[PDB]
Amino acid sequence: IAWTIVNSICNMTENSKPRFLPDLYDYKTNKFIEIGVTRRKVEDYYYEK
Amino acid sequence: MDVNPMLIFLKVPVQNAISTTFPYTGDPPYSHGTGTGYTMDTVIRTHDYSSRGIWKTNSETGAQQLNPIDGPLPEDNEPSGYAQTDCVLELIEGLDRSHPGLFETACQETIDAIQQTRVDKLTQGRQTYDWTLNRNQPAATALANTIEVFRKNGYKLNESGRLIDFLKDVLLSFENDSMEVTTHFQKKKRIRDNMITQRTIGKKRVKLTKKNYLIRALTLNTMTKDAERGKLKRRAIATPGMQIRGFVYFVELLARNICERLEQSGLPVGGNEKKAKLANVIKKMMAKSTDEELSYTITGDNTKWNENQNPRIFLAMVLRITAGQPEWFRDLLAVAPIMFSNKVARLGRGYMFESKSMHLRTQISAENLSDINLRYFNEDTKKKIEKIRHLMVEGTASLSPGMMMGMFNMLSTVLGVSVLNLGQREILKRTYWWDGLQSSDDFALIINGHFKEDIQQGVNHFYRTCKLVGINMSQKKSYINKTGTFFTSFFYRYGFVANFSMELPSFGVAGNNESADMSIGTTVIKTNMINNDLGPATAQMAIQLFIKDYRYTYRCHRGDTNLETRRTKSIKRLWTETISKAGLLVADGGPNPYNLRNLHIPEVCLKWSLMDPDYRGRLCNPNNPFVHHMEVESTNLAVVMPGPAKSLEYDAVATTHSWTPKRNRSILNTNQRGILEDERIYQKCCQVFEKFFPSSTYRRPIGMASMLDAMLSRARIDARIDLESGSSQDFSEITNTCKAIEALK
């Protein structure tokens, strides 16, 4: 399903197909969303992802 | 003057006129009754060959299991199954020696295979013995039943969706002593009409003991093989059960990956390549020799091939091949040899009796041969009934030693090959040496040396070395001559000649449908012109005769004929209605377009430009109700038998002539009447699932989740995006329905 969601979204927009599975998708701004929670700080995981 | 066609051989060499020694234009032999007499004959002979072996009662079964391996060495030319483990391992080791890292990659490929193999792969293939119903069933059902039973009991690892997890359950199922299975039986109700009896099927839960389930799992069904040519007497063939299938698949998959990389292996390649391998070995054997040396070829058949091949040895093989690999992989493959070592065989329908005086007949189940008076039978039979009773257990009969046709494959050939691989100069280091090609019981062997006695030494050495691993060359059916002429109905005479008669039965109407038969028919002619020297003139006549058979069989005679069938009128309407006649298909009363140059071009394609646009619009109307949408993997496929059984692909355009005939209806009367409804329901669920996943018909959807959940999840996003970027009242209506359903459990 998830990939069918990704494909379905990218097919009705000019968005490129992401390599890994994102977590959400905003319709107003048309942006794939990858959420990142962690016990560490923030810059570490941010620049890791 | 009396005419004698064999006198042709005075002038013409036998190979060049071999077509006359093949009577393949008449109906082949068919068994009328039962194969109990043949099954018992096999089971008896099997033990009789291993008689000197060690008997032991099985702990879990109580079966009188005979063991001939590592038994006494034989001392006569009679068939014998007293192989030697160390002698096998020596050959298997030598085979490893001669092919650096073959076993490595062979196993490695099997590892990736095992890991990646879904359970779905087991729905493919020949029919299997369904221990659930005690009858043979298509793999797809025989499996589905076993899974349902496993599910109803405490087994559901297969739910994962990978063969090895299902394959795990089978070993665990041997533990549960009380296995719960549902039976079906015929009850009779009473109905009133505005009063008559009524028939109806009811279900009855039963539980089986360890003793039973273990036997049923080790049970291998038996039948008489029909339509078998070349032989006066019928033979018994066997069908494996659902348990051992999964393992045999991987053992065979390993043995295949082995055989694929051996010159001396005839399997699994086709005739053209077999002949290429036979050419290669001859070229090599002649190039490797000196001018002052002899070369003899022996046309070879191994007598009682399966009866004298032992599962214990197969265990030794599979172990030695896997040497150095992960022990879970080592164990996984070792299963099938063990299950075979402890295999028990069903004895078919049984027998039928007849009273001359009273004019009556009666049937008796094979299970009843334990408790039965022997006054009914004749000598040969009742003697066999005697000999079998010592082995008989729980209806079935124990069969530890030997094998039976239609059980197992490939690995047996690896045995034969290793004996050929033994014959290298660099291994034997004698005044003689040998090489050849082998597939199952059939083998061709080239023996080289300096003298005729030198050759004799090689023959005997090869012959006895074969016996030491339970391979018996047929001294009656095998023979030898100087290298030049000699394999599986291929005939080499300083080069392979043609054997067209072998293929004659394939020249006819295959009986799939109007569409498929036309493509198969023309292709048959085509492939024989290429491979078996079917000449132009005869090939043209072959076209003519096929068209005649095709037209008569399907009642599709040409629109301008004066014949009278059930179709002639409707075909006549079409013929008059039609403007461009040449465009009409033979199935629609049109002319035959085919000749030597056309044979490779589908009829609809070949006649496309000549069709009335309406006609072809109707003919190829994708909305027609006659076709039923298959799956990509099963589209344009048919079944053919040369070998045991094989799929034949054909080229054709999907038209209204691409239909399937009615199904058999006998089951309506039987207790399994409900399977039809099961099928009817099961299909209807996939019919709608495909509406949510059209992709499913091309590639099988890998997924572990409720069928309904998958449909709903998509049903949402389809409905949403069809609006978002593509009315909200329809969207709300769809989401309301999606939720409304989802509420219901």
Place this chain on the structure above:
Amino acid sequence: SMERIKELMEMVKNSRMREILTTTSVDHMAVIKKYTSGRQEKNPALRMKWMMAMKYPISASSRIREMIPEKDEDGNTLWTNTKDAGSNRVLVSPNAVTWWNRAGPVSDVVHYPRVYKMYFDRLERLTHGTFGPVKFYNQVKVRKRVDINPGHKDLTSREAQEVIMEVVFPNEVGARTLSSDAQLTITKEKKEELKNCKISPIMVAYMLERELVRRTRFLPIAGATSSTYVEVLHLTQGTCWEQQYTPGGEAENDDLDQTLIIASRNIVRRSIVAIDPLASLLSMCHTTSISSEPLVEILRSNPTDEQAVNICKAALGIRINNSFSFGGYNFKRVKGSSQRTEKAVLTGNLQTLTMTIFEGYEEFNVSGKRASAVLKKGAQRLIQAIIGGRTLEDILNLMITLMVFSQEEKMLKAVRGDLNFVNRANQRLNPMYQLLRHFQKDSSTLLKNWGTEEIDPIMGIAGIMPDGTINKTQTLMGVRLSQNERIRVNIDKYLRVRNEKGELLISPEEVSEAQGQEKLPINYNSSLMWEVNGPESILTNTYHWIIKNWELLKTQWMTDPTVLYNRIEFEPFQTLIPKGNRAIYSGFTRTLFQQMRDVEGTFDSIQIIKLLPFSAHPPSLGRTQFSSFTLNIRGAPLRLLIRGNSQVFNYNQMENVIIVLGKSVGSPERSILTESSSIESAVLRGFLILGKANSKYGPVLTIGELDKLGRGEKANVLIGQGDTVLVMKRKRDS
């Protein structure tokens, strides 16, 4: 998006199937789909003959009852209500199928040939094909694996699956990347072509599957092996005949180049054997045609670099493709030849590249920009590079360019990190340019790893060190620093290609003796060539000609045999013999014939026929023994035994026929030859065979042990095929 969810509701309402839709998993759905009561029919031919006699044998969707009438114009019943076992499907008559085809609903299908392209391309080639004449002759066939799917846009199974999924199942696609323009262009083109064609997606996927992926098969083939020719084997070849045929459409460059090399090689190897090879060659070039196109006009326009081809180009006056350009510089090869080999190799970062590595000694004049160099190269080796330029930078640039071109292990070992350079049009450059644009940006480690020699000081020559310094007596491995026309090439009678300085560039003897099987059909219209291609043909026809003209040649064998031996019908046979054996073979043969004449009474015409074509060469005065003559045929050499039958020459008395490589070349003289009771001469040099060996003459000898016997002494010898015989050394000397 409605009726599906309505349907789903109406279904889920029923607990019967809501049970299934919840319980059975997406995986298990595959299992229950194939769940059937029906068996795979054992005898469908019988069953269909049985069933077609029945009124309603076909099963069709129930909607047929809405679509077509129950009864037709003539009163035939078209469908019934009886439902097919295990289906919601009804039983119908064949008259239903016909009614549909003459009165059913018409549909739009004109784009279907795009879907069934794989089929209609077969017709297309045939419709536009041209037939020549039919030639009758012994058609030898090689069992070989070949392509079955002409027009296969080559990409692996999963690579095709990805493309198919994209085109017919775009939204329900998996989750993989589209590798390159390879897949992309196919996808977009096929998506463009199949734009809204009313047809089942399953069929589209199926046709695409059959269409895109390669399929091979082992088949017996004579002649052209290209896919479009494989497609029509049944039409073009038979047991005894060839139907000359060219299929519609144009040939493929790879196939053309491949067969061009094969033709040129054969022409060269033939010409060598003739008197005035250059004259013989030019003739064959003007007469020969490939795929019904002049070999000359091909050579005029073909860039192929191959020794035989270049010899032909030199003879015809066409310039050889000695020149090319790389890394900006222009390379001109002055001696050597491009012996290329496909391989895979590891970089210093252990990345695997796929190279076309070159073998053999090669010499280049390299010139470009503001720098020039002479390059001597071996297989992955820089033997020497003498470089000059207007600036040390310009020199060093060329040095790098050459050090790359060398393909040494050093340079590859030196490659740190991965190489992912991409040319302007998002094109990924080949490994040779990849390695270049790498080191051109960082040649730091390359120079540290290349190594250094000490060298002797020579005026005008200097060395260069890895730090960029110039040193008189030290230098990087192979590199020398020191401060251009189209070369006029000539070729002589015997096809030796020389430069204007009189130095050898190409020798016909150096031409690879490789008998590969052509891709496209080759047609020689030459008297010097036999009618058929391949060495098997040369054998059969050579031995055929002898038998057809036997009596004429038998007298010639008696009176004036030196003329018989120089018959130009024996020339193509000689090509099958190795260069350095023809003389001693013909000498050995001619003397064996002379012995048969000197020693009256003894006569073996079959032995004469067998060995005769080996006599066609200026003999040598060697006195070496031979048990067999070797013949190079399709790579593997075959040994034709001097005494008795062989795989090459087999006289069969049961048929009274000579069999050459399994093919009858004809029946020898009526019976005259079966009636040849004699004692054997013409097998050994100076020896006579006198029947079975007698132990009275001691232990048996071998052929190598026959230079220690008195002239007249009798002895036992292992002569061949495990046979001992009594042998006598004759007194006189032929």
Place this chain on the structure above:
Amino acid sequence: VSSFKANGNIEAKLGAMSEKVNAQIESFDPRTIRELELPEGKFCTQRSKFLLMDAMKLSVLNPAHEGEGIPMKDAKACLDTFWGWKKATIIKKHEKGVNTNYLMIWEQLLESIKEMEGKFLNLKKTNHLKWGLGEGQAPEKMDFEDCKEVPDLFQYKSEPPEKRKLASWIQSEFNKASELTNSNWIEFDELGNDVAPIEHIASRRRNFFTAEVSQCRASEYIMKAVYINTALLNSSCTAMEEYQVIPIITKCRDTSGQRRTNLYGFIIKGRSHLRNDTDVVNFISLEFSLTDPRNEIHKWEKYCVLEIGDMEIRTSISTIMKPVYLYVRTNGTSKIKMKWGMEMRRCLLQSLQQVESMIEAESAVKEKDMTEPFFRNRENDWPIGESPQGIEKGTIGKVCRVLLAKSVFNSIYASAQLEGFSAESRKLLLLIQAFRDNLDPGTFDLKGLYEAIEECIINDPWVLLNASWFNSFLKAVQLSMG
């Protein structure tokens, strides 16, 4: 297993093993070996489904296609061409049958015809017909419990077949089957126009084949077989409960191209609830013939022959009147049997492929289309017979018909015996060939092979005849060789 390493086991076990276990090559020499052992017993009876050489046709001129017109109407038409009928009398009895029933059946049939209308004709279930068609002869099926204790309850007879001896007639049949006639028996469907030269060559070669073959008497048998088996299968499937009459019809063309309809007799189908492919349909054959059965009474064991009329015939100089007989019989067949009978035309392919190969093989070496030579340049140069004078050579045209007959008889007399004999004797033929090619053949256990072969020669005329043919070949080989 994991720790196993070969030191030298096979050689040790080899040394240990008894020396009796050997594969001694006994050199093979045809001049030495004996002839096959033919069985003894009563003579083999005819077992075909219709009369071969002894058949008689009542024919009519008819321009219709091959298979057009109502068969029964065509039959009535043919019946009229014969004037000299008689009251039916029995002249040769069917020793094991109620022969009066056959006589009643003939009259019944002949009357039912005279009184019919329409296409199909179903005979009323008279007891004398019921008897001939085996009505009710199936023992009723019972649960074992309800008949456990019956004295004579045994398993069905399961002994090997009763041996039989080789008679002269089966060779006579093949002699006639291998001959030309004055009627075109085979009508080939159309073909796509020739375009390639090889297709012209093919059609040129194909015309010759069609000429030599279409007139061969074996082709007439092919058409009778295809017609009968097709009619029976269709009738069997459609009319399971009725006794349907099926006239034995063929269509052909005179040497003048004049179309003709031939009637050989009738067939009366029994009930046909065929389930298994082996299941049997009983039927009654009723065929015309001039041949006096009493002149070869062994050939006709299963038959009851009536005498039904007379007619005149002319010889070379003289001319005399002869009587006409009706060979009546009860016979049986199965779905698989008539399925393969429907396909008998493939016999043409077996023959002609062999011939074409022979023509092609010479065309190869001669480098020329050797068709017109072989067929037109008439030369007798293929051994295909034995007279008192000795071995006789035939033409390629004759070989076609001989090979076609062989194929056709392989179909008509299909049997596990033939299946076995053909398979095993092939090895002996190859061994003979091997010696004749001077390839020094050797056998391990020859008498085991002889027994393997001989085991298959039981009671089938065709098998017996082929066994004989093999011996005649063996002797013929021994002579010229020795």
Place this chain on the structure above:
RNA sequence: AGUAGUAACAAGAGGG
């Protein structure tokens, strides 16, 4: 009776 050939068919099951 006949088919057939190492065992079957010569209808099977039901309204018992």
Place this chain on the structure above:
RNA sequence: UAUACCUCUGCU
């Protein structure tokens, strides 16, 4: 026990 009918099946 017999005689008539009636339904299902024709590779299961």
